[PDB]
Amino acid sequence: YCRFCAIGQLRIDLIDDLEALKRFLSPYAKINPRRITGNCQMHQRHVAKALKRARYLALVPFVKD
Amino acid sequence: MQYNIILLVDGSLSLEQANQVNEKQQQTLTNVEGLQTEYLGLKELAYPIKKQLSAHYYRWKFSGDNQSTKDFKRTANINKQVLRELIINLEREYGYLASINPKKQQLALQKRAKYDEIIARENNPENPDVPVTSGLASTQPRLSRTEKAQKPKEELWDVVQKMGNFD
Amino acid sequence: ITTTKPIKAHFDPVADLLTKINNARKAKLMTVTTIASKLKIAILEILVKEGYLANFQVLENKSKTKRIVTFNLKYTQRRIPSINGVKQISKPGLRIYRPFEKLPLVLNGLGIAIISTSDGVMTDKVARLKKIGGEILAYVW
Amino acid sequence: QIDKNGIIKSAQLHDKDVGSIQVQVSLLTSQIKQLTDHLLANKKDFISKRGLYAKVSKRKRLLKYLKHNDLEAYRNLVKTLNL
RNA sequence: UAUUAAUCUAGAGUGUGGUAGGGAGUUUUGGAAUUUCAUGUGGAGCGGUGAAAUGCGUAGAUAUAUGAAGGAACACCAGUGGCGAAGGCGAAAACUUAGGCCAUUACUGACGCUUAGGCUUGAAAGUGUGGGGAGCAAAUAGGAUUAGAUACCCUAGUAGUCCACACCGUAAACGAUAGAUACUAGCUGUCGGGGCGAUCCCCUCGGUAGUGAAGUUAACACAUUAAGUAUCUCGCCUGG
RNA sequence: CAAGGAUAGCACCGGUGAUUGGAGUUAAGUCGUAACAAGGUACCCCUACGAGAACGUGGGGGUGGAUCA
């Protein structure tokens, strides 16, 4: 199931769109795979890099469970 | 070529001293000027970056330079008055085009159709209404200009035929 | 008309023609396009006359800018091609030539070899009769 | 990045040399210089060095043609084949 | 044709515009925490296997939480994904930049093609050079067990795994499938790009896949990304 | 002048020589079965060491292993 480029902006930073990123997120340091949200390569890049970036800036649990 | 620069500065510093820290950060910033101290609020960090549970968030929006942000990034890192020094460039993946960026208006239409404000249904992204058969549809085939047609007859329609008379 | 699927310089006209011929034989395809040349026009005309190959059409854009030839194989009404094997002889890496007195009849004395000589291009039999020899372009049977 | 348009238009003497030998060899030489700068600033980028050698070879062949066709290529030789 | 005298683009390609890859490198940090030290409490066990034991614990453990330090490597995203020349690329963030995908009668007018020789790179062990070395295992060493363990068990454990340099330059670097080039039923998937339009469906081209036609390997099977078709060049090949 | 005769330095090639690696060969020699089932430990490839030895372990490369949808 494609998620980005339909609810996203094709330009994903942390601010202004963090909720679409957190939709593949939990306070548990995990990202929903393609089996639940089958987003394409660029959308997977978006969610991966941006979510681990929010983890990197101390916005959401980096590894914390 | 634009820099969205996000600075998370120390703990729960008061707004005035946080702004002064930010001003020092431009003073050690060699990128393009025009950036103004925009307070994004005091946001709770997911973890203490060094010891600060919550940090003051700030954003700066302006252009970007090539060999002028590495030094700013590492100086802002070393400058302990600011904890976190994220950069964003103009190019992440999106379009620089007048026929793929204005397709974000179709994305706004998608936002409108995301919630069924009426009894009728136009929800469920990736629901084929099939409104488009046009587009390019062009591999640019080579146009043929006749030079010589050596016996223009060509055989065609080879039916399955054998031993037509068996009676 | 509209001639589709142009081909550029592969490495030579002869191999560009051979690959298309064998692909048409493989996929049971009717008509294929390749490069145009005086030798190619001569051999294609002589193969139309010989019966192994069906007709062909030589096309240009405006000039040497692009010159191609589309060619069809003679097929009975059973998807059976008249071409039972064609082998290129003239090659870049090997320029092959034979005298008029050293040209054989292919198949079982039936196949006709296409031979360009000092003063023209013709068939193997009339090349032997002409008393003039030269390069061979294609063994066709 | 590529450093494409400015170098092309500097080497673009007229509207009749957008893809000529002149602009091609100028692009290869400018890319050799830029790749040397980059790979000195970025050591272990073996992609850059292999591309630099490939461009050196293609520049050598472009120069051998440009001297085979036009005899004025070496009378104003600012692109000598030595690297 | 080898040569010469010119031109035309379509091969090399180049231009334009749109144009993406965990590409490489450079520069940063952030954490799961590993280990150690102090704060402590705890009051006889921890530990390891197929089985125990070896080993660790009463200068106060098992374990626990804080603070501090040093090293290592980055949970998920990870793809019938893309890119990188193979080697490979995944905690994120930036920069230089190779190269890429889409369509260009657009420009030199064959400038082409490869490749013995030649140029560069080349997992890695392991070598020494300077640091820390967090952890562990070649070697080594005890208890097992064994017909015996320096094999399978573990504890102790160095080279090394870490980084800077060379050299080692070999790999299952093998798709045991060379590079450049053009073509061959389809079908069902994906990614990227171009057009379009709530999304979307759709078309175009590639990339990335397959069953299978044809074709091709004895055979196993490949099969539009061939081991199918064909040109130039090279490397490998005749019994154990 | 000369066939030729020479010096000390060197250079090329051959055989030999206390002592000796390696190969094929005796249906009937020593240990254990490593390994061929996922073959008694899954195989290995490159490389370090050691072990009678099958081999065993390190750091990387792979499945030329099964399981399994």
From Swiss-Prot, chain A:
Gene Ontology terms: cellular component: cytosolic small ribosomal subunit
Range within the parent protein: 40 to 104 of 104
Protein known as: Small ribosomal subunit protein bS18
High-level lineage: Bacteria, Bacillati, Mycoplasmatota, Mycoplasmoidales, Mycoplasmoidaceae
Subunit text: Part of the 30S ribosomal subunit. Forms a tight heterodimer with protein bS6.
One Gene Ontology MF term: structural constituent of ribosome
Example GO BP: translation
Similarity-based family: Belongs to the bacterial ribosomal protein bS18 family.
Keyword Ribosomal protein assigned: yes
Keywords, comma-separated and alphabetical: Ribonucleoprotein, Ribosomal protein, RNA-binding, rRNA-binding
Keyword check for Cell inner membrane: no
UniProtKB/Swiss-Prot annotation, chain B:
Region of interest: Disordered: 121-153
A GO term for molecular function: rRNA binding
Feature: compositional bias, Basic and acidic residues: 144-153
Residues included from the entire protein: 1 to 167 of 215
A single cellular component GO annotation: ribosome
Name used for this protein in its record: Small ribosomal subunit protein bS6
Any Gene Ontology biological process: translation
Cysteine-cysteine disulfides: none
Domain of life: Bacteria
Family: Belongs to the bacterial ribosomal protein bS6 family.
Function description: Binds together with bS18 to 16S ribosomal RNA.
UniProtKB keywords: Ribonucleoprotein, Ribosomal protein, RNA-binding, rRNA-binding
Taxonomic source organism: Mycoplasma pneumoniae (strain ATCC 29342 / M129 / Subtype 1) (Mycoplasmoides pneumoniae)
Curated annotation (Swiss-Prot), chain C:
Species annotation: Mycoplasma pneumoniae (strain ATCC 29342 / M129 / Subtype 1)
Name the record gives this protein: Small ribosomal subunit protein uS8
GO BP: any one term: translation
Assembly and interaction partners: Part of the 30S ribosomal subunit. Contacts proteins S5 and S12.
Key words, A-Z: Ribonucleoprotein, Ribosomal protein, RNA-binding, rRNA-binding
InterPro entries: Ribosomal_uS8 (IPR000630), Ribosomal_uS8_CS (IPR047863), Ribosomal_uS8_sf (IPR035987)
GO cellular component: ribonucleoprotein complex; ribosome
Record has Transmembrane helix as a keyword: no
One Gene Ontology molecular-function label: rRNA binding
UniProt record similarity statement: Belongs to the universal ribosomal protein uS8 family.
From Swiss-Prot, chain D:
Ribonucleoprotein keyword on record: yes
Keywords: Ribonucleoprotein, Ribosomal protein, RNA-binding, rRNA-binding
Gene3D superfamilies: 6.10.250.3130, S15/NS1, RNA-binding
Any Pfam family matching the protein: Ribosomal_S15
One BP annotation, GO: translation
Annotated function: One of the primary rRNA binding proteins, it binds directly to 16S rRNA where it helps nucleate assembly of the platform of the 30S subunit by binding and bridging several RNA helices of the 16S rRNA. Forms an intersubunit bridge (bridge B4) with the 23S rRNA of the 50S subunit in the ribosome.
Similarity-based family: Belongs to the universal ribosomal protein uS15 family.
Subunit structure: Part of the 30S ribosomal subunit. Forms a bridge to the 50S subunit in the 70S ribosome, contacting the 23S rRNA.
Protein name as catalogued: Small ribosomal subunit protein uS15
